[model samples]
Each structure stands twice: as C-alpha cells, then as structure tokens.
Target: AFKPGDLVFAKMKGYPHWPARIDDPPPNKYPIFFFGTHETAFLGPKDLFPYDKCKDKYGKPNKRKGFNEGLWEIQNNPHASYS
Candidate 1:
C-alpha cells in the first residue's frame, strides 16, 4: 500500500530506480511524482520501494541520477551519486 507524501524509489522495466513521492494512489496503480524532473508515473506496487532502502553498499542511492544529479534531494540528505 502507498500513502501520499511518503517518499519512495520507483522504477520500471529498463528504467532505473528514481526518487519519487506518492501522490494519489487509488486502486490498481500508484501515481508517483519524480523529484528532479517532477514527472509523474503511475506504477504498480512492485515498481516502488521505500526511498531509504534505495541506498547502496557505499551509502549512496542505488539508482541513476536524474538530468541534474545535484538538483535532487533525499529525505535524510545523504550523498547521492552514481557509481
């Protein structure tokens, strides 16, 4: 289940996990708002996971940086970069 305002890392086939926020999740699909791009994606439950868990072994997000890597922000304000 998803709750509005909760941050998450949403990804799809061919797409890497990206920072997003649950906006309006009805039934069937959940709509998430991307951070940097501010785009919206209606994804399934398996498409997203808790943003906190998106970290990698080195402590940065285990995901791809958006167009502007420095423009994005995590809730905990940890280092975010690509390996």
Candidate 2:
C-alpha cells in the first residue's frame, strides 16, 4: 500500500516512533528500508505505521513515545525513556 519516497512512522527496536522515508520496497523477509540516515535495516509491515494517522483523543498528534505506548493511557508511562 506504500511506495518508496513515502514517509512512514517506523518503530525500530529500542527506539521511539522514528520518522523515516521508505527507500526500497520489500522483497521477501523485509517489507521496506528506511532512508540511509536512520542507520537501520529493512522493516517489517507491522513495524510501519502511517505517519498521518494515529492521533490522540484530543485530536492532537501523538508523539514518538505516545505511539510506542500504543497511544492510550499514560499508566506508568511505560514508554518513558530512562536517561
């Protein structure tokens, strides 16, 4: 449903919702690869979410952490980064 050069919210391991542009379409095990700047590899279909979607109840766009937490309650703030 997507093509190269399109922007997508990529959920990379150990990272928040990263804004990435699709580079190449998937072949077999990989669905697509993010732009070179990401330093990541090809992503799976489930790992990619439509960037324009996923908004909070208030109609405001969710942040990276919010998206990672399933965009619901703030309980424990499970997606909270420890730094």
Candidate 3:
C-alpha cells in the first residue's frame, strides 16, 4: 500500500514487522509501506502494522532518517560500519 515516495522499510511476507529492503519485496506485487505516523507520513498503507493497544515494544521505533540513509547504508556501506 506504499505510495510512490514513502520512506518505508520493507519487511518480509511472513515476518511483517521485520525490516528489509524494498527490493526484497515479492516480485510484481505492490509492496506495503509502513508510515511511522499520520502527520509527516511518508506515504502508503493506512494501517500496515498490528495494533498493540496496551503494550509496546521496548526501545525506540526503527524509523529511517530518509531514503538517503538506506542508500548510503547499503550501497556505500555494505558492511554497515560507517555512518
């Protein structure tokens, strides 16, 4: 459900919450995108994640800084040692 310009982390089919690359999505299908929130929403699925009303995961959310962060991390730093 991701729109054209959403800054989403692609997750695997069975593991919906796990972060992955956009290229990792199933071929020929529209990959679902996860927006951290509605306000500054990058774009895509209106409701992509499961609701955890009373509980939440520990630590901060896995939000990407932007598309540049991914490209820089992957293409530039394959080992991911550099920022």
lDDT by residue for model 2 (2-81), tens: 67655566677776555554554346424443332334467766877765574222223344443433332222321232
Q: Give the winner by lDDT.
A: 1
Candidate 3 stretches with Cα past 4 Å from truth are 13-83
Model 3, 1-83: lDDT tens per residue? 43333233443343334222222133345443332211122212432332222113311344544433433443333332221
lDDT of each: 0.61, 0.47, 0.32
Candidate 2 off by > 4 Å:
25-37, 55-83
Q: What is the clash tally of candidate 1?
A: 0
lDDT of 1: 0.61
Q: Lowest summed-lDDT stretch of 10 residues in model 1?
A: 74-83
Higher TM-score: candidate 2 or 3?
2
Candidate 2 least-lDDT 10 residues: 73-82
Error of 3 at 51 (Å): 18
